[PDB]
Amino acid sequence: SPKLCLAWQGMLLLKNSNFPSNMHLLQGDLQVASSLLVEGSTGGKVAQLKITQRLRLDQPKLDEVTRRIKVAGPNGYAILLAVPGSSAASDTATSTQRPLRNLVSYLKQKQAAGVISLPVGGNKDKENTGVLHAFPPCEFSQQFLDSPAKALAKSEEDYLVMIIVRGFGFQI
Amino acid sequence: PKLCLAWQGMLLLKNSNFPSNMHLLQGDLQVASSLLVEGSTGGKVAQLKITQRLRLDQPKLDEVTRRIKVAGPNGYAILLAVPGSTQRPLRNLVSYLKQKQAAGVISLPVGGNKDKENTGVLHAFPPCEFSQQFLDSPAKALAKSEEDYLVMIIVRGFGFQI
C-alpha cells in the first residue's frame, strides 16, 4: 500500500506560470526523492521545480520510462502523486500562480509529460543527477494508482504522477 | 515528512472488521510504533478492538486536549485512519460513531501491561469540529469526505513522559 508520505511541497513552474503542489510517495525509494528534490550545490530545500522540456506520451517513450525504472532498481527511483497545494519587481523570474488543474489540463491536451532535471542546478557527474517526468492522468499513469491512491486523486483533472529516476544504469 | 503510513490492519467493533490505514498527523511516531503491538511479544498486530466509548461532550474534549499537552512531545501521536468477523467499509464505523456521538477507545498495547508507562489509550474520533483541528491542508486531502476518516489520538502513560 502506498506510504503517502508528504515528500515535497512547493511550486511547479512552466514558463511564466506556477502551480502549488503537494507530492505524496506512491512507491519506490523515498530517499531517491529526498536526495534529488534539492538545490544541487547545497542539498538544501527548494521551493520551486521548473519544467524545462516535454516528453511525448507515445508508446515508445512510455516503454522507455518503464525500462529505466527497471534498470535503476528498487533504490534508484521514486514515484509520487502530485496534488493541488495551498494557494518583487527585481525578481528575475515572474510568474502567474494558477491551480494545478491548469497544468494538468495542458499536459493532457499536449499529450506530454513535463521534464524536470534534478537536482536544481545540475551536477558535473552524471551519476549524482536524476530526472523527474510529470505525467498527466492517462492509462499509463493510472497503473501506478491503487485504491488508496485514487482517494487522494479526487478527479482525473487534478493530479500528476511524478516518476523520478536517479543516475545512469543500475543504482548501487 | 508527515502523512506516512504507520499501521495497516483491521479495526474491530463487535462482530465487524473495518480495514484501515493509519497515517501520521502529529506527535511522536515512536509512540504509535511501540504501542501498536501485541504486548507479550512486542510484535505486529493485525487487529485493534474498540472496547469502550467516550462521549463527544465539551468537558471531555477539553480534557483530551489537556492530556495531549501534558504527555509531552514523546507522549502522544495523532494519526488519520482512512479506508484500507464480517468485513465492512470504514465508513460504516464512521457513521456508527457519528450517530453515537462518541469516540472509540482502544487500550494499548494489545493485552495490556503491568507498568503504566508502557501502556497507552487510543481514542478514535469521528469527523467533527474537534477532530478536524488536527488536519492541515495536506492532510485534509487524504481525509476525503466527512464520512470516510477517523482521527486516532494515542496518549502513552500518565502525565508527562520523561
Author numbering:
A (entry chain A): 7 to 93, 102 to 186
B (entry chain B): 8 to 91, 109 to 186
Paper text:
SPOC domains form a distorted β-barrel structure comprising seven β-strands and a variable number of α-helices.
Although RBM15 SPOC dimers were present in the asymmetric unit, SEC-MALS analysis revealed that RBM15 SPOC forms monomers in solution, which was also the case for other SPOC domains. We modeled RBM15 SPOC binding to an 8-mer CTD peptide phosphorylated at serine-5. Compared to SHARP SPOC, RBM15 SPOC had a clear preference for double phosphorylated CTD peptides and mutation of the highly conserved R834 to alanine reduced, but did not completely abrogate the binding to 2×S5P CTD. Indeed, our RBM15 SPOC structure shows a potential second interaction surface at a distance from the conserved basic patch comparable to that between the two patches of PHF3 and DIDO SPOC (patch 2, distance to patch 1: 21 Å).
